[PDB]
Ligand binder design. Structure first.
Ligand SMILES: O=C(O)[C@H]1O[C@H](OP(=O)(O)OP(=O)(O)OC[C@H]2O[C@@H](n3ccc(=O)[nH]c3=O)[C@H](O)[C@@H]2O)[C@H](O)[C@@H](O)[C@@H]1O
Ligand SMILES: O=C(O)[C@H]1O[C@H](OP(=O)(O)OP(=O)(O)OC[C@H]2O[C@@H](n3ccc(=O)[nH]c3=O)[C@H](O)[C@@H]2O)[C@H](O)[C@@H](O)[C@@H]1O
Lengths: 638, 215, 101, 110
């Protein structure tokens, strides 16, 4: 028979000889870079490959070209794609470490020690699309002794696999499937261990702590805690039930080193104080200088453009939370008047077009930077393309170089227009392509600008270690969105322009038919998602391009003005305003001018926002139009 | 678009986690800033977009060993030092290859700017009659190598081998599959169409780089 | 090759310009006639020395995993072939005490 | 030094620093004016104030024996370069520097 083996480490080292002993013909062993599987197959005259991703047209269409009969997976780190499993007729079988269907996760050889399991053994099963949830074919279970540690149980379970593959494997050569499904309630998929997991919690049973210490005994990271501020590990310990009336974490004796837990005490045999050599428990408590003790500023947010669309509502949200010192820079405070006197907020005078020193100083003084200054009106892209590029790109980029130099975090505002005329059903930050018109379509001088800036942030954060997170709002709207007196120019977003047409009794123009559709997100939803990113719970945002938007509100500007008009008539001040001046469809080059182009549909993939913030939008279109209308309406001489 | 029109064809690049397009987006935003100046300030300009020009003196053999080399002279290096001709991701994507003489002629006509026909317009220089694949290129390359009077002095051909993208370019690469220029604006403004066919370009490029080596 | 075999750095040479290492070998006295440094065949992979040839049992090209000598010469792609500006000095103060000399 | 000069009669003290987490007691003292500043960044606010004042005391310095081997360049670039900029501000606008030298200047003196 012809076998393709995906093998790595000790398990793959033994399993390859187990398949070779079972009589199979080996014509392909795939592994990874660096007992080894690579040198093993090398000294056996076998061809052995190590691809980055085996699921690749150069590899998929050249694995089946070898004509495989069975495929065996002996501790493979990468996951196999179903198109590569169905290349061998008899099928593919992965040997998983835990006694399936238990601990069907990854690296379970540690977790069994952690929880204190009594037994566990190899389980060969049929690889399905479910994560290690196929059908059992063989199971040589192994018992966990009271003294077993990581390396010992490794070699013990390794012997179990090497022993199991000497029986069921010669029988599988004939084409039999003595398999059994798995009770999909009797499952546990314990995921990868992060280094912030081998940390000791002394307020638990000594059995628990000893189980942890054994689970990561050498050559694993090893359990650890902190005397004062000195990280020291514990390579080996002894469960000493002697409570010796002491509070969890208290040192009892220094020779033998004994630390009290919730019940009993843990006796530290060896360990290291820092990265110095592993030492004896007494010598361990010497370099630590232990005797008989126990064991184990607010955030500055810099807002460039505090008096603005996002800046106003962001300063309010950051301010309500107790522990935030927000520093907001702007040319005027004509709309942040409510928290000027607020102690947890300091306004500061500045324009990023002029100041190049004060900006840098404040970026040093703060912890996260939000350069919310940017001219973002479709008309200004064709009107003042050079002004748009110099302000939205050049100057804001200088702010970002400030951050990379002073090692700050940038919650930078990308835009939805970065996708441009994207075809995808929902615009995905990490997959959707970016389409724009030719150079003779200057409407994209904005889109292309914010994107190149995005990419430079990417480059810094990747080649130089800039802490960043990009968020791409999707047509946020609410109170304080431009001003009606500055909306008379055209320098205004879509919603408050139509509201102006209702106030002064001007026809509501529907540009180029008015039949294009966009997703409209409420201000409260967007400000919540931005705050969730700023809190950055567990680094879920670092390096990520998140996407804030409300897909539950896709409407057309005709649909938008329709919902707007019905809320205008129902307002207690409709009488104060002139009668409605009607709609009228107009050319684009009649309102925006020469060189305009537009995206027809717009839908955001809020997948990353769901996944990283535990956030999904709430406030629907109707509530936004009402609150937006109300605010702007009563903010008029009445 | 079948043939890329400077005045109509759109501009598509992958997402930010594809730093291959740091170049394309950069040259484009710069393109658009020129356009803005030329209309908001009256900058006299003309934009020309070469399409895989090649010929003598295209990178160096010494800078090709690092990767800092375009496809043609990189393969010429491979045939020079007994190194396999790698066909990244199958090597089956197609581009229109323009000869150095034709491209320079078109650019010269742009510099002359006979009757201001080039002002404000985005000229595109290319040869749509020379569409080929890197596979087909490398073969026409090899074919010119052995009938060259110095076939003998260089080591044996080391074979072809397909290679993953992120094995030669690394993290975050992507590629354009087909590329063909709309040479209308060139024709219309320059009175220019390409002439020299690919084989001459292949043969002269190799010939120069070959004898440009110590014996 | 033995003196620095695994887990030691390992011997190595250049396939034109790519760095490949030789982990295990067999000094092969059959002085099969080629230039010292010429490849003799692929399987076995043999390269000539002054008194015979060296035979490549295993090895690795670059840092991708270690393989058979045959697979090494394929990842490299070998047949009978062979293994394998002045300095700018800026002197500020050239007209002076040291510089002139 | 701020408290001493503040208790004294005719002293209008202008103090430049990035924070006020230790000078909180007299921040609003009418004869004390706090100004925001980093001697590494600001050139104009520092030069302005040197003109406006009579004596200058550039107390900004990194004086930790560990930082000399840890960050030798930032120690030099701050203790020397930036402080010297302030001293040329003083020679230009004709002011008196009560400059802080160090004991370490003698080094391993016998
Ligand atoms: O937040 C977003 O997603 C992005 O949306 C905007 O782009 P755009 O939606 O095209 O600008 P809008 O002011 O919202 O106009 C939407 C559309 O309404 C239509 N419209 C606008 C105004 C009007 O009077 N009549 C009218 O029909 C136009 O077709 C216009 O394209 C801005 O370009 C970005 O700054 C912003 O980040
Ligand atoms: O001169 C041009 O038209 C363009 O050339 C390059 O783009 P590209 O042609 O795609 O890159 P090349 O290095 O010239 O090679 C073309 C493709 O052949 C492939 N290739 C390269 C090297 C190789 O050994 N084998 C191979 O198959 C690569 O996928 C590569 O993308 C530059 O990206 C453009 O800036 C430039 O305008």
């Amino acid at each position: 028979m012809k076998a393709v083996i995906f093998a790595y480490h000790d398990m793959g080292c033994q399993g390859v000889q187990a398949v070779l002993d079972a009589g199979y013909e080996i014509a392909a062993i795939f592994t990874h870079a660096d007992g080894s599987v690579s040198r093993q197959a090398a000294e056996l005259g076998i061809p052995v490959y190590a691809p980055d991703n085996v699921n690749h047209p150069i590899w998929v269409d050249r694995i089946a070209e070898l004509a495989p009969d069975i495929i065996f997976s002996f501790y493979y780190r990468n996951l196999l794609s179903e198109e590569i499993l169905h290349l061998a007729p008899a099928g593919a079988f992965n040997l998983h470490g835990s006694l399936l269907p238990a601990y069907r996760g990854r690296a379970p050889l540690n977790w069994v020690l952690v929880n204190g399991e009594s037994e566990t053994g190899v389980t060969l099963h049929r690889m399905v699309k479910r994560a290690d949830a196929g059908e059992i074919v063989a199971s040589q279970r192994v018992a966990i002794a009271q003294d077993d540690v990581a390396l010992t149980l490794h070699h013990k379970l390794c012997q179990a696999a090497r022993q199991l593959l000497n029986s069921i494997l010669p029988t599988m050569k004939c084409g039999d499937i003595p398999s059994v499904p798995q009770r999909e309630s009797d499952s546990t998929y314990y995921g990868r261990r992060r280094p912030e997991d081998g940390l000791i919690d002394w307020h638990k049973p000594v059995s628990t702590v000893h189980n942890l210490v054994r689970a990561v005994a050498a050559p694993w990271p090893g359990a650890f805690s902190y005397n004062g501020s000195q990280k020291f590990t514990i390579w080996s310990s002894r469960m000493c039930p002697d409570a010796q009336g002491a509070l969890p974490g208290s040192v009892i004796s220094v020779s033998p080193l004994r630390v009290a837990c919730a019940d009993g005490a843990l006796e530290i045999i060896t360990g290291q104080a820092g990265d110095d050599i592993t030492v004896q428990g007494s010598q361990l408590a010497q370099t630590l200088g232990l005797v008989a003790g126990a064991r184990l500023r607010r955030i500055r947010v810099l807002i460039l453009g505090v008096n603005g669309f996002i800046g106003n509502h962001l300063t309010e949200r950051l301010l309500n939370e107790e522990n935030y010192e927000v520093y907001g820079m702007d040319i005027g405070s004509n709309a942040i008047s409510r928290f000027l006197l607020h102690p947890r907020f300091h306004f500061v005078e500045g324009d990023i077009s002029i100041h190049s020193e004060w900006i840098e100083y404040h970026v040093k003084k703060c912890d996260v930077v939000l350069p919310l200054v940017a001219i973002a009106t479709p008309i200004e892209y064709t009107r003042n393309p050079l002004r748009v590029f110099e302000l939205d790109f050049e100057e804001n980029l200088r702010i970002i170089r400030y951050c990379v130099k002073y090692r700050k975090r940038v919650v930078f505002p990308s835009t939805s227009e970065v996708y441009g005329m994207c075809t995808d059903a929902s615009f995905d930050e990490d997959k959707s392509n970016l389409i724009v018109g030719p150079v003779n379509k200057p409407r994209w001088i904005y889109s292309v600008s914010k994107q190149l800036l995005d990419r430079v942030i990417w480059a810094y954060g990747e080649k130089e270690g800039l802490r960043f997170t990009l968020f791409r709002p999707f047509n946020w709207m609410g109170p304080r969105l431009d001003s009606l007196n500055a909306a008379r120019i055209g320098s205004s977003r879509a919603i408050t322009q139509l509201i102006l047409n209702l106030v002064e009794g001007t026809p509501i123009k529907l540009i180029d038919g008015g039949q294009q559709k966009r997703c409209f997100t409420d201000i409260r939803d967007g400000i919540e998602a931005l705050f969730r990113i700023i809190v950055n719970d567990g680094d879920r945002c670092d390096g990520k391009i998140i996407n804030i938007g409300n897909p539950d509100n896709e409407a057309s500007i005709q649909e938008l003005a329709t919902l707007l008009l019905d809320s205008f008539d129902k307002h207690p001040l409709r009488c104060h305003f002139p009668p409605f001046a009607g709609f009228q469809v107009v050319e684009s080059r009649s309102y925006y001018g020469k060189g305009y182009q537009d995206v027809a549909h717009r839908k955001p993939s809020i997948d990353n926002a769901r996944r990283c913030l535990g956030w999904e939008p709430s406030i629907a279109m109707r509530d936004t139009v009402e609150e937006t209308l109300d605010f702007f309406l009563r903010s008029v001489d009445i």
